[PDB]
Amino acid sequence: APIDIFQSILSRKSIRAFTDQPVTQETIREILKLAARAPSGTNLQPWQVIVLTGKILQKVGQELSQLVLSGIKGEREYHYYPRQWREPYLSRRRKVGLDLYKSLGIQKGDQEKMLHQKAKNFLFYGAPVGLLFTIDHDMEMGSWLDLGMFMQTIMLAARGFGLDTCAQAAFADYHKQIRSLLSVPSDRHIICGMALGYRDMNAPENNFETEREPIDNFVHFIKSYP
Amino acid sequence: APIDIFQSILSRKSIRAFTDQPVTQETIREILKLAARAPSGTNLQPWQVIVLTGKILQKVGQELSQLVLSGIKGEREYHYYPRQWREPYLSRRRKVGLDLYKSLGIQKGDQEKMLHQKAKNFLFYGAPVGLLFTIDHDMEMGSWLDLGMFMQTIMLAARGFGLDTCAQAAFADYHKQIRSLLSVPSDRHIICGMALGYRDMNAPENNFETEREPIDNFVHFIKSYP
Numbered sequence: 001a002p003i004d005i006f007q008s009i010l011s012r013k014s015i016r017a018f019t020d021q022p023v024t025q026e027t028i029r030e031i032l033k034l035a036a037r038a039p040s041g042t043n044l045q046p047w048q049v050i051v052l053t054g055k056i057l058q059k060v061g062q063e064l065s066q067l068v069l070s071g072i073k074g075e076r077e078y079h080y081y082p083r084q085w086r087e088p089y090l091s092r093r094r095k096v097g098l099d100l101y102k103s104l105g106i107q108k109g110d111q112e113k114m115l116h117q118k119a120k121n122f123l124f125y126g127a128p129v130g131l132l133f134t135i136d137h138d139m140e141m142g143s144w145l146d147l148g149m150f151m152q153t154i155m156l157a158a159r160g161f162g163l164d165t166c167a168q169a170a171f172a173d174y175h176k177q178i179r180s181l182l183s184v185p186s187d188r189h190i191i192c193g194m195a196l197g198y199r200d201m202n203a204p205e206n207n208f209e210t211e212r213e214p215i216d217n218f219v220h221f222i223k224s225y226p
Numbered sequence: 227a228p229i230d231i232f233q234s235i236l237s238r239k240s241i242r243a244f245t246d247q248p249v250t251q252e253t254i255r256e257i258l259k260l261a262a263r264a265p266s267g268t269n270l271q272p273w274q275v276i277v278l279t280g281k282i283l284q285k286v287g288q289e290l291s292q293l294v295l296s297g298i299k300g301e302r303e304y305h306y307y308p309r310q311w312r313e314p315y316l317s318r319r320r321k322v323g324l325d326l327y328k329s330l331g332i333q334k335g336d337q338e339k340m341l342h343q344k345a346k347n348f349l350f351y352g353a354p355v356g357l358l359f360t361i362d363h364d365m366e367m368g369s370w371l372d373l374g375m376f377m378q379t380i381m382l383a384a385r386g387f388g389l390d391t392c393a394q395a396a397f398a399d400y401h402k403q404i405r406s407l408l409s410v411p412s413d414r415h416i417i418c419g420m421a422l423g424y425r426d427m428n429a430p431e432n433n434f435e436t437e438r439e440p441i442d443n444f445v446h447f448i449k450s451y452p
């Protein structure tokens with residue numbers, strides 16, 4: 001009896017601490033076969049995945065964490081977040097960041113703690129599987145919708161196996177080093193990553209709540225005309 | 227007892243013919259509340275939705291389909307699809323297009339049938355609910371990942387209610403006309419639409435299959451270092 005679609009949606013959260021329980025290769029393959037059944041414009045299936053486990057996962061994570069801790073600034077190819085920050089987006093970002101820091105006992109402005117927490121991103125938060133997503137250079141903006149559809153399918157499918165995830169744009173910061181480490185072909189662009197693994201159930205960062213906007217704040221229902 | 231997550235993922239298909247059964251506002255709201263639980267970078271939740279039913283849905287479909295049938299060309303404000311078409315993308319697009327046409331009995335050279343079939347997009351394929359998605363002008367690329375995540379959550383949640391969908395970039399063709407008809411504020415951009423409804427299980431266009439790439443075509447598994 002697998003979990004139901006609604007249970008998958010509601011139980012999915014961003015998990016940032018994992019146990020050392022390994023994920024079988026067969027489970028990873030089945031998750032990705034399910035995700036490949038995401039829709040995409042004219043069935044182009046633009047998603048490309050790199051799966052890191054074992055020694056190479058540890059090497060990549062440790063090398064990228066050291067770039068952060070060494071003070072090497074990120075350099076992204078694309079703009080992910082707003083260039084002009086304003087409300088209500090300001091407050092949404094501020095709340096989840098403050099709630100994460102509170103769970104970890106980090107005071108705002110403690111730069112040493114903030115940096116060490118940031119660096120954990122690049123270890124995929126200690127997950128036993130690290131996923132990186134790339135797309136071909138000829139792809140346009142539609143393919144980013146497609147990629148989000150594919151990634152959410154991974155995240156929901158994972159719940160079917162009792163697995164957890166964290167989507168991670170952090171990796172975009174070090175696309176040049178990732179390209180070097182993994183010999184990523186020049187015609188592919190690294191878009192983002194995702195941690196996959198079994199949650200550390202009692203880690204405090206896995207036990208806070210996130211809000212969402214009430215639907216009438218972002219949905220306009222229309223029926224009448226004129 | 228809702229369907230399981232895997233059944234939702236695999237049974238989802240792009241449905242292009244619907245019954246005349248309406249969808250309750252309660253069910254639309256439930257679907258959107260579930261979709262709101264998609265993840266987004268820093269919980270920005272950039273998605274905005276316009277839900278069309280009843281008279282206004284009929285009117286939008288009428289106006290936009292008549293633009294197609296009258297010869298009025300689309301003008302998109304973004305590039306959704308590649309500007310340079312190459313293999314393997316070319317074959318993927320051609321195969322789904324040829325299989326749709328085959329299901330419909332549309333032969334090479336049937337220009338009026340092809341125009342008719344294209345125009346059906348703009349009626350949301352006859353669905354009782356039409357969705358349009360917008361995002362704020364300050365949002366950047368990342369928000370397209372987020373919107374994709376949200377949209378696929380709709381599509382999968384819908385299966386839990388016995389409903390079906392078709393994601394549709396087609397509406398981007400007539401963003402100017404949609405903005406005027408629905409008074410979409412100037413700081414929001416129309417990204418794409420989606421049909422929602424009960425599939426017509428007898429319609430031939432709902433009774434073909436789409437391919438997906440085998441996972442070795444696009445997943446690279448790496449474990450060893452070096």
Ligand SMILES: Cc1cc2nc3c(=O)[nH]c(=O)nc-3n(C[C@H](O)[C@H](O)[C@H](O)COP(=O)(O)O)c2cc1C
Pocket residue numbers: 037038039040041042043142145146149238239240241242322347392393394395396397418436
């Ligand atoms: C972002 C996006 C835009 C799409 N645009 C259209 C569209 O305008 N009209 C249409 O009939 N199908 C559209 N499709 C549906 C795809 O053709 C379909 O997802 C693909 O061929 C795979 O088939 P499946 O969804 O049945 O698995 C779109 C799908 C996506 C994800």
Ligand SMILES: Cc1cc2nc3c(=O)[nH]c(=O)nc-3n(C[C@H](O)[C@H](O)[C@H](O)COP(=O)(O)O)c2cc1C
Pocket residue numbers: 012013014015016096121166167168169170171192210263264265266267268269368371372375
């Ligand atoms: C595209 C995308 C990129 C994200 N990037 C990161 C990241 O780099 N690091 C991180 O800890 N969380 C990241 N997040 C997770 C979000 O912060 C999280 O989804 C949001 O706060 C809502 O919380 P939830 O996923 O627990 O519901 C990302 C999420 C998305 C969708």
Ligand SMILES: [Cl-]
Pocket residue numbers: 076078079080081
């Ligand atoms: Cl950014």
Ligand SMILES: [Cl-]
Pocket residue numbers: 302304305306307
């Ligand atoms: Cl386009």
